[PDB]
Amino acid sequence: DPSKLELEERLVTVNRVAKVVKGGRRFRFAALVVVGDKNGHVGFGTGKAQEVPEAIRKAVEDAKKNLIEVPMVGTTIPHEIIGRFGAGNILLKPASEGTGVIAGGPVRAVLELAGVADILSKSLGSNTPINMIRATLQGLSELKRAEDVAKLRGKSVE
Amino acid sequence: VMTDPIADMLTRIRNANMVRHEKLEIPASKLKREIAEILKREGFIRDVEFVEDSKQGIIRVFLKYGQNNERVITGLKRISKPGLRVYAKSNEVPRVLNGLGIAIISTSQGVLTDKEARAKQAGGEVLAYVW
Amino acid sequence: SERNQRKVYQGRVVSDKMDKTITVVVETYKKHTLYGKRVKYSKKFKAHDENNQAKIGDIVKIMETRPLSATKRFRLVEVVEEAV
Amino acid sequence: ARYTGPSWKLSRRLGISLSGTGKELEKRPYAPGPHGEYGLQLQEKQKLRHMYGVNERQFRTLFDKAGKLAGKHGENFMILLDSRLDNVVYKLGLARTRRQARQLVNHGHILVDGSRVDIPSYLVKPGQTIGVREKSRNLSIIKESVPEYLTFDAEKLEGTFTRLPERSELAPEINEALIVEFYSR
Amino acid sequence: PTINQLIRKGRVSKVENSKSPALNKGYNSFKKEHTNVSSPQKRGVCTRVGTMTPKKPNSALRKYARVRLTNGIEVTAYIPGIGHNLQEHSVVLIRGGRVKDLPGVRYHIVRGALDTAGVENRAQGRSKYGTKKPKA
Amino acid sequence: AVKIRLKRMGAKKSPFYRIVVADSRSPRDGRFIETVGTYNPVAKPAEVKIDEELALKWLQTGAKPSDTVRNLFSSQGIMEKFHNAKQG
RNA sequence: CGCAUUAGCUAGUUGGUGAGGUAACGGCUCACCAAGGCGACGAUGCGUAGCCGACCUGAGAGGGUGAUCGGCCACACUGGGA
RNA sequence: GGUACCUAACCAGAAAGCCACGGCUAACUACGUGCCAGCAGCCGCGGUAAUACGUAGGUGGCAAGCGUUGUCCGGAAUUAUUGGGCGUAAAGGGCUCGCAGGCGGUUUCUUAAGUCUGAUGUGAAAGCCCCCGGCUCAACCGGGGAGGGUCAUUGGAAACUGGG
C-alpha cells in the first residue's frame, strides 16, 4: 500500500525511443524510476510520454502501485541471494555495519531507497537498467525473514 | 545409469516440492534414510515412513507446506558429487543462507547438520545444502 | 635412541627381466591443484632383489637404500602377495 | 603544499560553512564564478577534507588507517581527523580559525605534554595535554581567542584531550557513509 | 566442461598483443638480432615527412612522419600540434598512441624532445606539446 | 670459527644491533645460526637485552664473543656465569 | 614453464659380475656377460628461464614479477685441464 | 661534523605549478577558426550560436608536483574451480565398436588409502598483518605475536569414497 508512506523518488534513466511511421519517426521518453520509503519499501515504475517531466510522473505513479517490502536485519539484508531476471543477475551479500552500499548503478538506487545501509553486490550479468532493477527486486522478494522461517519450520528463532 | 543416488533423492524432493505434491516415494538406502531423518528433525518435511520390500526398501516422505501453500523447502543442492567430492574441515563447515538453511555433513561422528557438526568440532563429506 | 627409518613403499612388480633387479610401480592419488579431483599417478622404482624371488605381477614391499646402481635406490623387503 | 587561497569560495561551492559560523554563506550562498552520484560522493569528501584542511594524499591514508580500527569506518575516520593537533588547538579555542591553529602549531607555539610539536597533522591521543610555549604565552591571536571531549583552562592556556569525540560531537553536516562510498570505488 | 575434461585439457587464456609493437623490440648490433624489451619511447630518424588524408568521414591534411627507429623498424608516426620543424633526417622521439583516423599510424612523435621543436604560441596543455612557460 | 657478534639492522644514522651467533665466514648482515639478543647503543643509556640460556649454551660450545659483545655480556653478568661454570 | 605444426628416445644405454677410482655410494670408469631402460602420467627435441623468502594486483581464487634486502645455485674474455 | 638539534635577531619578505572542464568524469562562458587548422581513449568533434579545435576569464582535481607513454594486475562470473556456455547468437563429434581412463545399486563385516581430528618436528631472518615501544609526527625503525605445507612423524574417529 502507498498512500500512508512518504516516498522519495529517484530517476534511474530516460531513453528516447522511436517508432517508425509513414512520414518518419515518433519519438517518446521512457522514464525508469525507483521509489522508496527508506524504511524497507521500494519499487519501480516505467512511464512513456512525449515530454520528459510527464514520463517521470507516469513512472512515479507506476512505482507506487508496484512496491515490495524488503526484509532487513539491522542495516543489512538477512542472507546472501542472487537475484535473476533474464540475463540480469545480481549477487547481494549481507555486510557489517559501516560498510556502506557497495553496489552498482540501478542496483544502488534500489538498495539506497529501500533503506539498506550496508550491503555488498555485483552485477554478474546484463547491465540493461530495467532488467538490472528487475533482478534486484527478484532478489529482495526472495529474502526470507528469520522469524517467518522459524514459524514455517515449527522452531524457535533461537 | 544411476550414478548419484543422493542427488536423485534431493532432486525427487525438489521436483515433488515444485508441483506441491503431498508425498513422494524414494528407493531407500541407509544414508537416504539418515538424510530424511534430518529433514524431519529440522522441520523441512512433515513425516518420513520406511516401507520394506524384497528389493532395497522405500522411503515415503511427506512434504510440508505452510498456510498460504508456502513451501518450507525453498531449495536443495548436492555439494559433494561422484565426479568431484568435497570435504570440509571443522572450521570451514559451511553456513547455509546465513543460518536459516542447513548443510548435511557425513562425518565419522555420524551424518549431522552443520550446527551439529560444528558443536562436535567435526568436518567431513559435505553431502547437501537445504534452505 | 633407535635408528631413523628409511621410506617404505608397497607396490606392484612390472618387470623381472633384469638380473637381481625388479621394476616396482607405486600408484598414489595426487590432488589436482586447481580442480580438487584426485588423480592416479604412477611412480616406477627399480629395486634390488638378490634371489630373484619377486616376479611380474607380485605385490612387493621395498625399502630405500644407498644407490645400488645408476637407477636402483631400493631393495626388495617382502613379497606381500604373489601373482596369478 | 597547503591551500592558502580564498576560504569563502570553498564554503560557497560546498554549500556549507567550513568556519562553522556562517558568513561565507550570508551574502551569496551559491557556487563561485559566473555560473552561480559521483558528484555527491566527491562533494562530501571535499566537504570534510576542506573543513579540516588536509591534502588528498594525506586524507586518503588517514582513511586507510581508520579502516584498521574496530567499529564504523566513516565514524572512526572522523574521530582521528578530529584528533589532529591543529584541530584540537582550534577546538580548545586557542585559535580563531583552523588556518590560524595550523600556523600556531607549524611555527612551534604549541606544546604537547610539555614538549614542542610543530606538526599540524600530529594525531593527538587521550591523556595528552596541549599547551602554549613560554615565549608565546602572550601572543595577541591567542589572547583574542569548547566541546566535552576536550577540557580547557583559559588562565593557564593549557587544554587536555580527555576522551575520543564519539561522532555526535563531530560535524553533523558530514554524511561519512558517502565518503566511505567515495573510497570504495 | 566436466571436471575430468578440465583435468585432461585445461583452460587456455587468450593472448593480448601490444598496441605499440615497435616500442617492444630492441636490437643487438653484435648479435644482429631483435631483443624482446619494452620501452616507453624510442628514437628514430625521419626518412620522409608529409601529409595524409584521414579515413572518411573526417577531412584534413594530417601531418605525419615515416621514421626508422633505433631497433631498425620503420613506422609511420603522427606529428601532433599546430606546425612543426621536421624534415628528412630529423632525429625524433616516438611515443605510444595510435591516431584513430589515419590507417597505419600507431605512434605519435613527442614534441619538445630531441630535434622536434615545441609548439609555438601554445599556452594551455603546454606540456603535451613540448612548449616552455611563456612569461619568465 | 663460530663467533658471537653484532648484526647491523636499524636505519642510516640510527644503528641497532642484534647479537647473533654466526660462523665467521658468513656476511655480517647475512646467514646466522641463532639470535641471542639486542643492543641499541643509540638510546641513553644503551638498551641491552640478552637471553642467558642461549648465550651460555654458545659460550660453552666455544663460540667466541666479539669485543663489544664480550663487553655486553660482562655488564649483564654472563662472562661471570661462564667462568664459574668452567670451574663449578 | 611453453610447444605434439616435437612421438619415439637410449647403446655405458639398463642390469649383472669383477677390478679400478672417489671423502663417499654409484656405469663413476673399464673388461666381460646379459638386453635391457625411458615414453601418450608426454618421453625426446625445440624454445624460454637462475630458484626461493618475497613483491605488485585482486573480495578471494588467481595472474604477473623475482630490482633493492636475505637464502641457495651458477659464472668470472672463451673452450679445456690440473 | 661544528653536522643534527637548540637559543637569539630580522623580513610576508625568497618559495605553485600541472592537467582538465560534451558524456564516461569533478568542473562553462566569450572570442577566433569554419570538415580548414586541429582534437581524440572511446562514442566522436570541426562547413557561422563549437561548453569537444586555438586562445581568454573562471571553475574543477591534485599539488612540488602534474600530465603522457610503456609494462603488469583489476574492472573482464571475459578460459568461468570459486564463476560461462553449445535448438536458432561461436559451440553436439557423420555413425558405430571399443582399449586406457573417468564414473558406479542395496545390506552387513572389516581395513583405513582417501576423509576428519589430536600431538610433536619443521616451514630462517626481514617482509605482510596484529599488539606495543622509539624518532617533535609520519615514513622509517625496533620488540613481542600471528600467519603460511598437495610437509614429515606418531595417535584417535569411522559416516562417506577406496580396498578386501
DSSP letters spanning F37-61: EEEETTSSSPEEEE-HHHHHHHHHH
Distance CA B32, CA B29 (A): 5
Helices (H), B1-130: 5-18, 30-42, 114-120
Per the document, the length of chain B is 131
- Host H or E run for residue D59: helix D56-67
Distance CA C39, CA C34 (A): 12
Phi, psi of B93 (to 5 degrees): -70, 125
Distance CA A14, CA A37 (A): 22
Q: CA of B88 and C1' of H115: distance in angstroms?
A: 9
Distance CA E89, CA E16 (A): 34
Q: CA of E99 and C1' of H43: distance in angstroms?
A: 16
Phi, psi of E129 (to 5 degrees): -120, 5
Strands E74-78 and E105-114: parallel
Distance CA E25, CA E38 (A): 6
Which amino acid belongs to residue C43? K
Reduced to 3 states (helix: H, G, I; strand: E, B; else coil), residue A90 is strand
Which amino acid belongs to residue D44? E
Is residue E87 packed enough to be buried (19+ CB in 10 Å), middle (13-18) or exposed (0-12)?
A: exposed
Residues (34-93, chain B) with CB within 7 Å of strand H atoms? 56-57, 80, 82-83, 85, 87-91
Distance CA E43, CA D64 (A): 42
Contact C10, C59 (CB under 8 A): yes
Contact E53, E103 (CB under 8 A): no
Distance CA C27, CA C40 (A): 6
DSSP letters spanning C52-77: ----TT-EEEEEE-S--SSS--EEEE
Which amino acid belongs to residue A35? V
Which amino acid belongs to residue A156? S
Q: Does D180 touch chain A (CB under 8 A)?
A: yes
Q: Which chains touch D (3 or more CB pairs under 8 A)?
A: A
Q: What is the CA radius of gyration of chain D?
A: 17
In chain A, which residues have their Cβ closer than 8 Å to the Cβ of B131?
A: 144
Phi, psi of B117 (to 5 degrees): -60, -35
Q: Long-range CB contacts (< 8 A, 24+ apart) of D53-60?
A: D53/D2, D53/D3, D53/D86, D53/D98, D53/D99, D53/D102, D54/D81, D54/D84, D54/D121, D55/D1, D55/D2, D58/D121, D60/D183
Assigned C-alpha cell, F53: 640460556
Comparing alpha-carbon positions, the chain C residue that sits nearest to B83 is: C37
Task: Please report the resolution in angstroms.
Answer: 3.1
CA A43 to chain centre: 5
Which amino acid belongs to residue C74? F
Which amino acid belongs to residue D55? N
In strand G, which positions have an atom below 7 A from any protein CB?
A: 3, 13-17, 25-28, 34-39, 41, 62, 69-72
Residue A16 Ramachandran class (φ > 0 left, ψ -120 to 50 alpha, else beta) = beta
Q: How far apart are the first and last CA of chain A?
A: 32
Q: Would the CB atoms of B66 and A151 count as touching at under 8 Å?
A: yes
Reduced to 3 states (helix: H, G, I; strand: E, B; else coil), residue D118 is coil
Phi, psi of D133 (to 5 degrees): -80, 160
Strands C38-48 and C74-81: parallel
Contact A19, A35 (CB under 8 A): no
Distance CA F39, CA F48 (A): 5
Strands F17-23 and F2-8: antiparallel
Distance CA A78, CA A118 (A): 11
Comparing alpha-carbon positions, the chain D residue that sits nearest to A98 is: D72
Nearest CB to A153: which of B72, B98, B99? B72
Residue D59 Ramachandran class (φ > 0 left, ψ -120 to 50 alpha, else beta) = alpha
Q: How far apart are the first and last CA of chain F?
A: 26
Best residue in A11, A34, A99, A107 to probe D by mutation, most D CBs within 10 Å?
A99
Residue D4 Ramachandran class (φ > 0 left, ψ -120 to 50 alpha, else beta) = alpha
Q: Would the CB atoms of D177 and A100 count as touching at under 8 Å?
A: yes
Q: How far apart are the first and last CA of chain D?
A: 26
Q: Does B43 touch chain C (CB under 8 A)?
A: no
Residue E121 Ramachandran class (φ > 0 left, ψ -120 to 50 alpha, else beta) = left
Is residue D91 packed enough to be buried (19+ CB in 10 Å), middle (13-18) or exposed (0-12)?
A: buried
Per the document, the length of chain D is 185
Give the residue before each break in chain B, using a C-to-N cut-off of over 2.5 angstroms; say none if it is continuous. Answer: none
C71 sits within 7 Å of strand G by its CB: yes
Distance CA D174, CA D181 (A): 13
Distance CA C59, CA C71 (A): 20
Q: Which chains touch C (3 or more CB pairs under 8 A)?
A: B, E
In strand H, which positions have an atom below 7 A from any protein CB?
A: 6-8, 16-21, 24-29, 35-46, 54-73, 76-77, 79-81, 84-86, 101-108, 113-118, 124-125, 129-131, 134-138, 140-143, 150, 153-154, 156-161
- Fill in the DSSP letter of residue C33: T
Which residue in the block uniquely carries the three cell numbers 621394476? C23
Which amino acid belongs to residue D157? L
DSSP letters spanning E32-56: TB------S-EEEEEEEEEEEPPPT
- Host H or E run for residue B51: strand B45-51
Q: Does B83 touch chain C (CB under 8 A)?
A: yes
Experimental method used, please? Answer: cryo-EM
Per the document, the length of chain F is 88
Distance CA E129, CA E117 (A): 9
Distance CA B21, CA A55 (A): 46
Q: Does E12 touch chain C (CB under 8 A)?
A: no
Assigned C-alpha cell, C77: 623387503
Assigned C-alpha cell, D132: 602554549
Q: In Å, how far are A115, A149, B98 from B124, measured between CA atoms? A: 40, 27, 20
DSSP letters spanning D32-45: SSTT--HHHHHHHH
B101 sits within 7 Å of strand H by its CB: no
Best residue in C31, C33, C37 to probe E by mutation, most E CBs within 10 Å?
C37
Whether the upstream peptide bond of residue D32 has omega within 30° of 0, thus cis, is no
DSSP letters spanning A61-79: HHHHHTEEE---BTTB-SS
Q: How far apart are the first and last CA of chain C?
A: 43
Q: HSE of B20 in the Cβ direction (CA atoms, 13 Å)? A: 8
C61 sits within 7 Å of strand G by its CB: no
In chain E, which residues have their Cβ closer than 8 Å to the Cβ of C39?
A: 7
CA E60 to chain centre: 20
D172 sits within 7 Å of strand H by its CB: no
Q: In Å, how far are B32, B129, D12 from B35, measured between CA atoms? A: 5, 11, 67
Kindly tell me the sign of the dihedral angle through the C-alpha atoms of F66, F72, F76, F77.
positive
